[model samples]
Target: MVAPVSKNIGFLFLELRLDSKQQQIMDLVLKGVNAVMDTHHRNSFEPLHRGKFGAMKPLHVSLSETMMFANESELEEKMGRIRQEIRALECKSVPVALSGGWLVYENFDASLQFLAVGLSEPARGRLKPVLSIVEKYKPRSPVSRQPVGLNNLHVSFGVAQNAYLQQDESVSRQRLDSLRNLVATEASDRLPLLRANLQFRCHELKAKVGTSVITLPL
Candidate 1:
């Protein structure tokens, strides 16, 4: 019998700052002020799904990174550009807050208890340039411990499969391999390491999920 697979969990977080004006810029870049609404519609939620975990969502996610901008004037210019872009898309009124860093999965239910973990070697290859640009921006703001940009922008991806019924070794191995390949192909590379946190059994359902929270460090 394949031993009862154990689950592995990981977390990360990132922080950045923005002034009042810079904050406005962020709202323009991330969420439009007018775009505010209740819950995200179903169509909006489809692209973010990664996979499912047992009796729990794939993972819980959020963004808490905060920082101040360096130049208020420049920040405004950037914000203006973002506004133009959204307008081009025929959208408006977006809310501004932390950028990037969001959960890929939510509380999901599963029957089997197969566990798997792997890194997308290809994802790293694709994201290098995006990371470079974010790094090029460097200490998004000035007042900070390190003047240089952050290097520990960790990006992680994971997946879990249903438990095997019969002792079909080939099927189990195939399922695990497929998950690794899928993550490598789907997840983006430029996603900087934001803050990732976890809460388990906090509610009545007694579930566990990792939330990768992050924001642009100004």
Candidate 2:
């Protein structure tokens, strides 16, 4: 059975009970991934790309490409819509969701690699927004309160499984390596700023997700 393992900056652990039924699990998986897409790509008129590293157009990507879960009932409902659509089309898929309020997983190496790649571009993309948000909200100082450091931020993924039967280790390693290259090769002027912002945002998300955890029966 695949499980979620999550930790925040404060080192809190959150876990969720995942339905073992293959069909249900697959259904929930799609729902979770789609929820992220819907939330992040609501306005994209074209097919949304599956997280940054995903090759298949959003519509073409399958349940295996990413991991997903929802702790809240409202989130479950929203995720359910995606499953319903797939069923309507007679597509074979799995549906799964957290049994309770929390979903957690031990870090899967490949998923981490995918996250690093998917996030690399957006982390850089955030320079403008970070500047805008700071200017609008905390305009007193042009510099952030905290100095830039990798320790201040991190990125991770939530998934139902630690290993996918279909995924290979070599591909995962390649993705991770590519992520390192992307960061290292970033324009000299932009790297520091992007690194700082990415770190800060990662910490922020860890805190946000950690606080929302609710334990479920295994």
Candidate 3:
């Protein structure tokens, strides 16, 4: 039988800051997503707005695996270590550039799916040191989720719950495929606008430990 997890085991991730131009591009991307969803009359997915998580949820490129710490102390220590490592590497902030198109991604079990915009080729390379630092201090327990793919580096656009898609597996897959195509079609119009240039940066990281939170500077 599986053991119960403690509440203290929380999340750690890097957060990105987007300039006005980036925000505008994100809005355009979501507009396409919304138009497609409206056209097809599909309410299965929720398009993320700027304030979905809070008053201002900054877009982020996840640097760690789905993380879980043993407790708050351990979580804080890991954050400190990560800060130190990045400082040693002389990386004050991670350089970022977006590919400017929609990417349809689904999780391992197909229980969740996401619409996100990926990083540019050179931008992906710029994250090597930061990625390796997170990996080095990543949780060793089975409680953590799988490592995220480099291509999965993105600013989130929207998300859908599998159950909302359909109850039957085959039907859900069909619906999911249709949704993907629609997103692609809508996204094609704003492809040029989406290739965001170098105004993005990751100077801070946030960790939600239990009900409390901490922000560490990079």
TM-score of each: 0.22, 0.23, 0.79
lDDT of 1 at 178: 51
Q: Which ten residues in a row have the lowest lDDT in candidate 2?
A: 58-67
By lDDT, highest first, what's the ranking?
3, 1, 2
Candidate 3 residue-wise lDDT, 68-176, digit = tens: 7777688677767877777687667766677765777777677788877788777678777777877788777745446665756776656777654447778888877
Backbone collisions counted per model: 38, 14, 1
Instruction: Give me the runs in candidate 1 sitting further than 4 Å from their true place.
Output: 1-67, 71-73, 76-119, 140-218
What is the alpha-carbon lDDT for the whole of candidate 1? 0.27
Model 1 residue 193 distance off true place after TM-score fit, in angstroms: 23
Stretches of candidate 3 exceeding 4 Å from the true structure: 1-7, 19-21, 52-55, 107-112, 161-166, 197-199
Q: Where is model 2 more than 4 Å wrong at Cα?
A: 1-106, 112-167, 187-189, 195-218
For model 2, residues 1-218, the per-residue Cα lDDT tens digits are: 22333211111111212222422333344454435435543111121223355333211101111212233343344233433332344223212111111112224343322221122343334332322322232213222223222122222222322233246867544544443343234312332332332222121111112225322111
